[PDB]
Design a protein around this ligand. Structure first.
Ligand SMILES: CCCCCCCCCCCCCCOc1cccc(O)c1C(=O)O
Lengths: 315, 297
């Protein structure tokens, strides 16, 4: 199932989601509504709400509480962007200016808090304490993960298995929760629930790995990870497999939290070791674990589209 | 029922509150840990959790989930101060944003662990209103206005209101009792913020930023024409830096501080009056005492 056909199957749910997002931008304070509109209409893929919508349909859900959770998921994600952009001091995202470049840091942080607290209101109104517990843990764990990276020294000598552990237990948890809570809301089976949960985790993992490799895929939002010496998978691979010169270069970049001027050198180092392809290969295995976790659910068009999203994510 | 007797009656409860704060705030990052220390060993009289703990007790609660409510309210407060410390071009922005995100999100985890949907409805609405209000205040430095009570309600009162109310709710209190606690928190919160506004002309940021607070507005409406003009243009300019002396002259000569404390006293009486719906206990006596203390600076 290609993107076009996934979009076609999902179109009416996704349009209910678009409506439900725009509905909740209803403050007296216009700055909230305009900054929120600014970011939500900017071309987002809305893959997290897409996964939620699909999962509920994949386990037979007939109502439209799933549109609601998809919308609030896109709100959580939106709030995490607005904060990421302020933290990472970014001026551009997706071709154009960021919320903080356009409106400033304070409004960015504060409209993000509004947006997060609204999603938590939307979630409460669905009346599942279980979903609230799962979702509110996933967000706190992501925020904890950000404070760790900030306040500490990146360990260049992290094991690969411990790197994946960070993704499984923290960075992908929104993807995990998007699928799982949708399942829980549809009264799904415990087997089905664990299936969607593992699919979300694995797809988000695959997605995180591809995003990281794509950050180095230049010549067409490229190079930011190496500029701040961020210890991602492809960069660490080149450090372990490159020449001790390349290694030591990539090492000082991670130790400084600064790899400015280093892009082309690291590209050549990566290209020699096959680091990008090897990351694309690690990602494929994640996509297959996601696809395999779904086999516990009925064979449906919605299941095909989830399987389709996983293949698409790993190009 | 003075401050020290209120502290001793609320002591065992506050020990649980303090432990829950340190429990939820031990991290592998030291900034977070030190924060917990500064909260529990903080300088102030922490009336927010004290109200949360007393509101429950005063409606028959014998459990210990009101300790979680107390803790999470103080988390909400703390995280909102952290996000206020974020600035634009002209403990950095990154750490204020992220540590405040960690704390706010943990507060939501703690709310939801109590297992009440009613509490979560109310607590999630109050925090949304607060966040909305911070953004209003932002729009207000960009376009000042000399109105009139809606800012302080969102900035301060709403969270006192939710703290009293949800504690009531969590003890399965009567709807009458819920309303009395809820109003008690709203009126005490309002009185608290009015007292705080008046104490700022005594560290002094409100005037530096040309913030239209109650004492400054009163002086603009009752002061001589020159004082009126001076104040109006500091508010609309967003800058009263160095004007303290002539503003204080204006406030003293037409009674702006005293009039503000009096209006705070009025709100505190209302808080007390909402509480007469509850049973007569030492817990209610202590709630009543907090309202008096809040409005004697
Ligand atoms: C009042 C409560 C407000 C709480 C706000 C909740 C959000 C937690 C705060 C941490 C934000 C971290 C962003 C997660 O990473 C991303 C996510 C998505 C896209 C991205 O590019 C990124 C990225 O790492 O660059």
């Amino acid at each position: 199932m290609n993107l076009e056909k996934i979009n076609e199957l999902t179109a009416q749910d996704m349009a209910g989601v678009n409506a439900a997002i725009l509905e909740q931008l209803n403050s007296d304070v216009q700055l909230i509504n305009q900054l929120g509109y600014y970011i939500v209409s900017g071309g987002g893929k809305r893959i997290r709400p897409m996964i939620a919508v699909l999962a509920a349909r994949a386990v037979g859900y007939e109502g439209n509480a799933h549109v609601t959770i998809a919308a609030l998921i896109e709100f959580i994600h939106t709030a995490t962007l607005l904060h990421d952009d302020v933290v990472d001091e970014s001026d551009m995202r997706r071709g154009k200016a960021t919320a903080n470049a356009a409106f400033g840091n304070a409004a960015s942080v504060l409209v993000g808090d509004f947006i997060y607290t609204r999603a938590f209101q939307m979630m409460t109104s669905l009346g599942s304490l279980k979903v609230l517990e799962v979702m509110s843990e996933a967000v706190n764990v992501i925020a904890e993960g950000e404070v760790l990276q900030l306040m500490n020294v990146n360990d260049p000598d992290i094991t690969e298995e411990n790197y994946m552990r960070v993704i499984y237990s923290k960075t992908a948890r929104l993807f995990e929760a998007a699928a799982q809570c949708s399942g829980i809301l549809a009264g799904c089976t415990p087997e089905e629930e664990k299936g969607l949960q593992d699919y979300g985790r694995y797809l988000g993992t695959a997605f995180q790995l591809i995003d990281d490799l794509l950050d180095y895929n230049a010549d067409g939002n490229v190079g930011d990870d190496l500029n701040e010496g961020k210890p991602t998978l492809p960069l660490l691979h080149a450090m372990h497999h490159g020449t001790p010169e390349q290694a030591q270069m990539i090492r000082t970049a991670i130790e400084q939290g600064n790899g400015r001027h280093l892009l082309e050198p690291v590209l050549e180092a990566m290209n020699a070791c096959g680091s990008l392809e090897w990351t694309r290969q690690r990602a494929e295995e994640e996509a297959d674990k996601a696809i395999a976790a779904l086999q516990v659910l009925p064979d449906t068009p919605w299941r095909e589209a989830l399987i389709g999203l996983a293949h698409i994510a790993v190009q």
